[PDB]
Amino acid sequence: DDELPVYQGETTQTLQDYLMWQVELTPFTDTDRAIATSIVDAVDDTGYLTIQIEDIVDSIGDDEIGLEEVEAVLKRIQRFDPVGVAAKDLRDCLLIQLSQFAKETPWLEEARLIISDHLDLLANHDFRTLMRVTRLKEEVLKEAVNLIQSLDXXXXXXXXXXXXXXXXXXXXXXXXXXXXXXXXXXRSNLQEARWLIKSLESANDTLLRVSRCIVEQQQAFFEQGEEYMKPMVLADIAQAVEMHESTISRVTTQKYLHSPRGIXXXXXXXXXXXXXXXXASSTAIRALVKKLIAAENPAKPLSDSKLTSMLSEQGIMVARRTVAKYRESLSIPPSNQR
Amino acid sequence: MVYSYTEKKRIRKDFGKRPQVLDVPYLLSIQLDSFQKFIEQDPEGQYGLEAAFRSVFPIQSYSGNSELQYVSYRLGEPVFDVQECQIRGVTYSAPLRVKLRLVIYEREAPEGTVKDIKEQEVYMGEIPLMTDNGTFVINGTERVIVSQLHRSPGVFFDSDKGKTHSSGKVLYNARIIPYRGSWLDFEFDPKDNLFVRIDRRRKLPATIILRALNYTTEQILDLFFEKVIFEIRDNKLQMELVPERLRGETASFDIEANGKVYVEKGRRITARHIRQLEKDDVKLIEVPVEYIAGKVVAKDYIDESTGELICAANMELSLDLLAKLSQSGHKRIETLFTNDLDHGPYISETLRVDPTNDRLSALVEIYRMMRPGEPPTREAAESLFENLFFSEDRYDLSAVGRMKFNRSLLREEIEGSGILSKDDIIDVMKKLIDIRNGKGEVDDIDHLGNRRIRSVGEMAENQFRVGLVRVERAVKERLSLGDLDTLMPQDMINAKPISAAVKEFFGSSQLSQFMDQNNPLSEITHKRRISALGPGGLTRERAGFEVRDVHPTHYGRVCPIETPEGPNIGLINSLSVYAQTNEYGFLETPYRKVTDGVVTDEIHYLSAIEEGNYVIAQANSNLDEEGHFVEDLVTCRSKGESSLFSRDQVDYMDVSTQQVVSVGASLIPFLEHDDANRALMGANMQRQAVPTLRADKPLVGTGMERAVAVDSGVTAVAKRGGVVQYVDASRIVIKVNEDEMYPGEAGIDIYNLTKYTRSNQNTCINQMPCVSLGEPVERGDVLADGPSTDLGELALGQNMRVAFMPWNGYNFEDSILVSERVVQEDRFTTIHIQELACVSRDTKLGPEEITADIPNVGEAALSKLDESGIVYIGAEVTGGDILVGKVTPKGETQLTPEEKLLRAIFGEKASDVKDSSLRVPNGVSGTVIDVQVFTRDGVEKDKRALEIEEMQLKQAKKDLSEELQILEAGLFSRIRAVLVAGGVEAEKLDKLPRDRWLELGLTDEEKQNQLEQLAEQYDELKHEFEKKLEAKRRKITQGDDLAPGVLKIVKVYLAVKRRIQPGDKMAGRHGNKGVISKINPIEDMPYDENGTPVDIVLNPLGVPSRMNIGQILETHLGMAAKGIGDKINAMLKQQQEVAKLREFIQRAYDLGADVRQKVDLSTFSDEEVMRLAENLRKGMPIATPVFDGAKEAEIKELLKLGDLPTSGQIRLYDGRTGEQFERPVTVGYMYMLKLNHLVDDKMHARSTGSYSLVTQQPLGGKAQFGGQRFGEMEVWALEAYGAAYTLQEMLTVKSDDVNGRTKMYKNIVDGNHQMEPGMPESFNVLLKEIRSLGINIELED
Amino acid sequence: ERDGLFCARIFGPVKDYECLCGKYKRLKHRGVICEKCGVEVTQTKVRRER
Amino acid sequence: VPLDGGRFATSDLNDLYRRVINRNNRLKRLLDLAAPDIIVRNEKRMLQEAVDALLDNGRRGRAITGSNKRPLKSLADMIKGKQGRFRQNLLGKRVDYSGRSVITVGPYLRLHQCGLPKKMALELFKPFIYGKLELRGLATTIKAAKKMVEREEAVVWDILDEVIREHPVLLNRAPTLHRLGIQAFEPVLIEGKAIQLHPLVCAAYNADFDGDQMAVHVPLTLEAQLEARALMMSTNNILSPANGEPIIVPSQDVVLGLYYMTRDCVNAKGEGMVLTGPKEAERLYRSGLASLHARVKVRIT
């Protein structure tokens, strides 16, 4: 309705909204505005990625309209407010961000064009042999690299994500004797509707009792003090109150339990039974696998088979494949550096 | 009277002729005494918690034989102080604990009890306590709770003023009003029949409600009417005579009394023929038969043989009946009287309309009547009947209801049960009919006799009782087949309903509001306020214009001047000065007692009902040393009136002239000369003033300022006083006299002043010490001044040399031109502190950390931050400089060459984190005065979070160390004293500290006694003091109670000085307001022959039309006030002797007729006089109380002593042209204020901003950048001009046309200025919303 | 939720030319519909019309 | 209506749709179940209650909810705030390029003008400024312009003057009672936070200077500017289109000064001189004479 501040909206501006605003105000032709609108949607909240170019060209359905037309227009779009916008590959991002250094920057212009244009793939590790490639030495190259490292990446300045999306918790786990104890914190027609409320008010009091109950059984199923969490099956919680698996997983999926470590509520009931006599499921396998891979490789061992042998020494019956596959995942440099 | 101490630093001069008797009271007192009576142990049981415990306990369960009871309450001590609690943001309260005895008994065994057990205490809720000053701190906010004035319980009557039926009548309706429960309202019909309404129900017959009382129709009519008699035996037909019962009638036949005619047919009915038959003894006489035909039978009459059928009741007798009753042999016949002059035949027509007079039919009729549909179950009837009134607790009118119910019906006993009864309602109907009969009048609802005040005691007790009953309906279920776990007063009580109800009240409630913290006098006047609104009544817009008006009983109870001028007008009132309140909740006001024609100094508080009976004199009247009135005819008040009476008639007198006026207005000089409405503004404007850097004492004033200041509790006042040991800006200690002290505590008193602190209105609170050092202080003297206080006076504005005269149109209308001097000298410069908070919390994606370092952010921006990331204390911050930085991680960035490449090049720069930080709001400014940083336990905060830890720890250690230095000095004095008797080493004993290792054994007596006492007391004080430091230390290192979804907390304070500009909104006490039009250079102002320019120039043309002449008299006396200080200035500046200075000040103080202030010098000597004179160098502060104030004559007299012209006008010169103005001009000191309206807060301006999702229009207001409602009248005005393009771009392009706003702005940027109007969103919406009903609306081409 | 208030399909998409079911993500097509759902792309101002 | 911590809460109008859907599904379920006429009867009743409650929460009694209740709102109530289309549409759009400040007096500043606070324009005129900046060539791109007016240095104030020149603004106050209550003026930039309004128009506006506040609006286009010059400028309408008699009439200290200038007085030096032109300024300014008097005989064309 009106005359009050109903949550009508804010109409904030994202990056694509703002870029399109910036396109509205620039001297594009009828067609070039179609290519521009075609590119600004391709852009991402991350900036740099304008995804595939030749799909931008082919998306228009031929009829002339070469590659060069989208290329020029593309450059000009890449030139709008947040300096380096879009482009591709980060290389051209840093070349567009480097396009304006005012040209009055000492030593930076040339060196920066050489480093940023080409050979930047080898600049990851360190200088080393690159120092011999560009003939530079001492701090001449190091100061240019200070500028290159001073650039930042793409957009993510427009952002428009003021919403942190907090957790709000649901049930509090007051820590007891090296464990956890639940408390669960935080005329006649409508009169007959009043009655439904009595039932809703009676169920509202038991809503906390379900959280404290399932929470108590969840604390009894997995040891808190132990590394990760003891392996459990939904059949235990389904054994206690005799509730269906999907229902319990739904309650733990919706609500989020706050313990002293982890905010992480439905992950405390999901585990494997390992299917082995000698033995914390995949939690400690992948967790402690990445932990053992954290301190290792004095220089560049890059050996996942040695880590698989170390896992087999612990009595987990490693397959040298599964263990290495789960260990090398999630950004793990293992086996990649070989 | 030698005054006291700080008072002798500046004495105002008093012009008030009338002596004072009763001292002005505590002012605030009305808050304290309420809540002080709500927290008490009472033996009688009422008055506070005890009453809510006894309102339920003991509980009976369901046929349980076991029960539960409770014994007192007690309390805990509050965990935090008021300042701590205010900082931390925690609500300030204390634990409520109660010992409940449990009695468990055996089943089937009568009176037998198997066991009893009770918990030490059960802890239920925390009740918020009250500060000393009248506020409840709640989540670190002050919040004053407002008193409410509500229609009182008891019996009420109303004429309706016959404004309904259009014929006109008197329709007398009576409503009964309980404290809690249903309402019964008896009314009259246009056809003259009584009706019963229950809780605003459609009318019912009258005799059903009475029929519920087990009264038969015979008992109904016999009980509610006359008895009389009639007798016919063998056609003798002798009826009883009732001459006194009738004032008139028409006689159809000759009436013979004992063989002689008393009144012939058609003879005079006048009192001659009445007393003629009165003085003569006359028995029953015979009358004509035709007269009986109009009479109606009362009691049911049946024949001896047959009792069948006819004539039960309420039937006009017929000639057929005479034969039957005459043949039956009944000698006596009792019939109703019903002769209509005063009396009337009511209640009988109600029986005519009553469908059935049976009890059960009435109970079923009302039972089925309450709820619209209902089956005739018969149980609903028995339930609702006993329930809706006679239940123990269901309907309770309580003590005001019972008392006023007794005095309403004129019952002698003032005590009774809180539930109604048969005879109660019967008597109410009796009085109601009596009002119709002409005997008796109605009650005025506006009368203060009928309107009671409730304060925070009584209301907290209400909600606490509510909350407790909602517990008891639950705890009743533990013994309900909940069986036995024992351990009952632990698990059985749930504290959650009690606590949520109490903190629900104080939190959120119409009558708990944030306190007005700008001004002391704003504080005060908030905390004595009586509102008609809220929970208990007066929904407003529907109230009507009669509760607005001043009624004659508000005389010295509320105030007729102080009231909001806004559309709640007369609704929100303010207590008058000397007003108080009874135990029953009624306003009573003091009076001096006059016996014979001498005025005794005994005072009596009279209530509004008590007051009207008597005669009361006038506040300002004459009098003699003996105490007799000078004038023989004295103007007095009686009842609703006023007029002159004789000397011997009046028994009372008004105490002081301040009685009518409220404290707000009691401050305004010359309030007589002001019109009341204009007085009415200015009283309101002194609230919304704003305290400035240096506080100037008002130079002319009422005398009231000392009370307000020191009562308001914004000043620091010295308890138990003595000489000042140590002084400083933040701290002031008093070494108390040896006289007042608690033995064994010894020690001194410390006072920590509060430095710069946001107020609820984002203004400074600052205390600055008045006292010097090495100065004696008595109890009650002010050590510091709060803001807008000078040496214990209330100083809300500044004095300004004013000139009345138009000046080039710059002061036009109500505007106001000011010398640049004023702006240079920084009066009117006011501080403003603003809070901003940063909180760092746990998300789904993991925890958030604060600072060092951030993605995508320059070193430039980060230069003002710390190692920890909070800004250095002291930084100047503007615009979107980063006050605290903070990082929020995003989801799972893994692989592919570009991601690994950015992570390799830049080191990922913490990768998924974002930029989320505490940047300053755009368009705000100021230095960072303080940072708090509350953390979490076990977060391992380190960094700079520890600086406040060490800081507060050093402050606490330094504050405690003083008592150890003084007590250790005393113990060292005893040890140093005992060593003199024997083995005295003199200096060698002083140069060897630490007991000189006991100085061996000395004598055995000194060995055991001196070593035991010295070592014992030494180790106990050392270990105890170190223990206090360890407990406090454990209190320092910890983290607060806090939400599960928050990790660590930081708050930053900013301060800005704001400088007056031409948006000032300056005012004066007299309802004077304006803006600042211009700031002139100094040479451009008008100046006098000595070259002193006026500060501020104001427009004479204000003053006649508005008729506020306080202004003018203020100026003149102000002029004369400066004059004396100029004499003294010039005198001390010439290094005159003390004697002559003494002579001129003494000669100044003593001027005027009467004036009752006798201060004279020679009592205080040498300095003390030099002191004050230097204290009054800047002007002499003359003080004119409200209606006894200074006369013109005294002002000219005072003014001639200053060699100023008597007329108060002076030649002034133009500043530009140098030319004399023709005609003299009034110049004078008037005392100005700066109001809380500043344009910095006002000027907005937007071009294109954010819109609304639906309707797509710009947002509401500034801060959010509204654009500016262009409303229906504004369109009408354009249409009227016929300018349709301007109107068309308003409607569309610049609000809801989305494509057209874009095209518009793009063409503007390009210089096209063309519209391309489209169709506004909001129309489209409407078309969907009408399509949402089954109506199509489509636009047809 | 599918077939509910608020729902995709009827009432249109949620992101501009990006739609649920993660396919034909942008501007490849003026209209189109997924195989998982009836999502019809074309812009998302359509929550204000449909 | 999204919340503080996330986890969106349902709006007022949604509840009505949820309710109707629940009763529709339950009546359908019991209808396809082939059950007694009593219970499906009560379901027919309940659903008419539900749809009638979603179209108007009035019609009968209670409606509302257990939410703190209040009638809620319905699609009937949903009609434009005041249940007229007052709000939102119909003369009532809230609006753009607008601002508002306190009024002071204008005591130089001729009738057709209006002291507009320097800081406050610069906002109102933003689009206009960027145009000029791009013309002069001080900004090649919109972001450049944008940045220089954000930095608000130097050329920009110089261009502001050039933007404002002859561009009529329009001011409006409070209750607008008659058409005079909004009028149009040539602004003159003035450092300050407040708007200076010429005295003579204070009549019309019914405004004193005790803290009244004015809105300001910017006509764009051309048509609108001309309608402001040739209709709403304060110099078009000096006469009140009710009674017809002039507004603009001098009040308050203007009156007092004319009335003082023209008086007669007895004596008051330099009486009965004969002079021509007069001009007579000579003589008042020089002393020589008293303007209240002399009953000087002067020659006049």
Please tell me if residue A59 touches chain C, with a CB cutoff of 8 Å.
Answer: yes
Long-range contacts of B1132-1137 (CB under 8 A, 24+ apart): B1132/B1173, B1132/B1174, B1132/B1177
Q: Residues 6 or more apart from B246 whose CB is under 8 A from it?
A: B339, B341
D52 a known binding residue? no
User: Which long-range contacts does B193-201 make (Cβ < 8 Å, 24+ apart)?
Assistant: B193/B346, B193/B349, B193/B350, B193/B353, B194/B346, B194/B347, B194/B350, B194/B429, B194/B432, B194/B433, B198/B366, B198/B370, B198/B388, B201/B369, B201/B370
CB B399 within 8 A of CB B584: yes
Determine the Cα–Cα distance for residues B358 and B420; give it in Å rounded to an integer: 22
d(CA B855, CA B284): 116
Q: Which residues of C touch A58 (CB under 8 A)?
A: none
What is the distance, to the nearest Å, from the Cα of residue B549 to the centroid of all Cα atoms in its chain?
Answer: 20
Task: Return the residue in D45, D87, D143, D147 with the most chain A beta carbons within 10 A, the one to mutate for interface testing.
Answer: D143
Q: Which two tokens stand for residue B426?
A: 């019967």
Question: Residue A159 and residue B1255: Cβ atoms within 8 Å?
Answer: no
The reply to whether CATH 3.40.630.30 applies to domain B714-788 is no
Q: What is the CA radius of gyration of chain D?
A: 33
Q: What is the CB neighbour count within 10 angstroms for residue A196?
A: 10
How near does any CA of chain A get to the CA of D42, in Å? 11
Residues of B in contact with D210 (CB under 8 A): 813-814, 1073-1075
Domains B153-225+344-444 and B829-939+1040-1058 share a fold: no
Contacts of A42 in chain C (CB under 8 A): 26-27
CA distances for B1141 relative to B215, B1122, B1170, angstroms: 92, 16, 8
Smallest Cα distance from B1329 to chain D, Å: 7
| Rounded distance between C-alpha atoms, residue B116 and residue B234, angstroms | 79
Contact yes or no for A11 and B902 at CB 8 A: no
Architecture of domain B576-656: Roll (2.30)
- Among D7, D12, D64, the residue with its CB nearest the CB of A190 is D64
Inter-CA distances, D173 with B815, D176, D180, D217, Å: 18, 6, 10, 11
Name the closest residue on chain C to residue D16, using Cα atoms. C5
* Alpha carbon distances (Å) from A282 to A121, A265, A272, A326, B993: 36, 17, 7, 9, 70
* CATH node for B940-1039: 6.10.140.1670
B contact residues 1063-1082, partner D, Cβ 8 Å cutoff: 1063, 1065, 1073-1078
Minimal Cβ distance to D131: which of B813, B1260, B1311: B1311
Torsion sign, CA atoms B1086, B1087, B1092, B1094: negative
Q: Resolution limit in angstroms? A: 3.4
DSSP percent split of chain B into helix, strand, coil, nearest 5: 30, 20, 50
Nearest chain A residue (CA) to C18: A41
Q: Do C27 and A38 touch (CB under 8 A)?
A: yes
Q: If one looks up domain B829-939+1040-1058 in CATH, what number appears?
A: 2.40.50.150
Burial class of B1335 by CB neighbour count within 10 A (0 to 12, 13 to 18, 19+):
exposed
Give which of B1044, B1038, B1050, B1042 is closest to B937, Cα–Cα.
B1038
Count other C-beta atoms under 10 Å from residue D5's C-beta. Answer: 13
Q: Which residues of D touch A185 (CB under 8 A)?
A: none
Helix (H) or strand (E) run with residue A181 in it: strand A181-182
Cβ–Cβ contact D17 with C under 8 A: yes
Is D22 in CB contact (< 8 Å) with chain C?
no
Report helix, strand or coil for D92: coil
**Terminal CA-CA length for chain A:** 65
| Closest-CA residue to B284 (of B254, B247, B257, B322) | B257
Burial class (CB in 10 A: 0-12, 13-18, 19+), B551: buried
> Tokens 């606590």 — which residue?
B499
**Are B838 and B918 a contacting pair, CB within 8 Å?**
yes
CA–CA separation, A172 and A211 (whole Å): 9
Cβ pair C28:A55 closer than 8 A: yes
Inform me whether the C-beta atom of residue B1044 falls under 8 Å from chain A C-beta atoms: yes
**From CA A10, how far away is CA B468, in angstroms rounded?**
44
Size of interface B-D (CB pairs under 8 A): 263
B943: left (phi over 0), alpha (psi -120 to 50) or beta: left
Residue D96 annotated in ligand binding: no
C-alpha dihedral sign at B1037, B1041, B1043, B1049: negative
Q: Please report the residues numbered 2 through 31 in chain C whose beta carbons come closer than 8 angstroms to any beta carbon of chain D.
A: 5
Return the number of CB contacts < 8 Å for A and C. Answer: 11
The CATH fold of domain B153-225+344-444: 3.90.1110
- Residue burial A91-128, b: 16+ Cβ < 10 Å; e: rest: bbbbbbbbeeeeeeeeebeebbebbbeeebeebeeebe
Query: A interface mutation test: which of D142, D147, D150 has the most A CBs within 10 A?
Result: D142
Partnered with residue B1068 across adjacent β-strands are B1232
For residues B1125, B1128, B1132 and B1135, what is the CA-based torsion angle, rounded to 10 degrees? 160
Length of chain B: 1341
Report whether C7 belongs to an annotated binding site: no
Query: Where would I find the H helices in B239-394?
Result: 271-279, 319-328, 348-353, 359-370, 379-385
Q: How many CB pairs under 8 A join A and B?
A: 94
Distance, CA of B257 to CA of B287 (rounded, Å): 10
Q: Edge-to-edge strand order for the sheet containing B716-717?
A: B716-717, B782-785, B768-769
DSSP category for residue B399? H
**Partner A contacted by B1249 (CB < 8 A):** no
From B959, B929, B931, select the one nearest B752 (Cα to Cα): B959
Strands B1048-1058 and B830-840: antiparallel
CA–CA separation, B758 vs B763, rounded Å?
6
Chain B residue with CA closest to D198: the answer is B809
Tell me the pairing of strands B530-531 and B147-151. parallel
Q: D34 to chain B, minimum CA–CA distance in Å?
A: 30
Judge: A25–B905 Cβ closer than 8 Å, yes or no: no
Report in angstroms the alpha-carbon separations of B630 from B621, B623, B1189, D224. 9, 5, 21, 78
Taking CA–CA distances from D75, the nearest residue in chain A reads A1
Angstroms from A16 CA to nearest CA on chain C: 10
**Between D6, D62, D77, which is nearest A165 by CB?**
D6
Nearest CB partner across the interface for A3, out of D12, D82, D143:
D82
Q: Are C16 and A55 within 8 A, CB to CB?
A: no
Question: Cβ neighbours of residue C50 under 8 Å, at least 6 residues apart?
Answer: C10, C11, C12
Q: Where does B657-713+789-828+1059-1242 sit in CATH, by number?
A: 2.40.270.10
Q: Is B973 left (phi over 0), alpha (psi -120 to 50) or beta?
A: alpha
Q: Where are the domains of chain B?
A: 26-152+445-575, 153-225+344-444, 226-343, 576-656, 657-713+789-828+1059-1242, 714-788, 829-939+1040-1058, 940-1039, 1257-1341
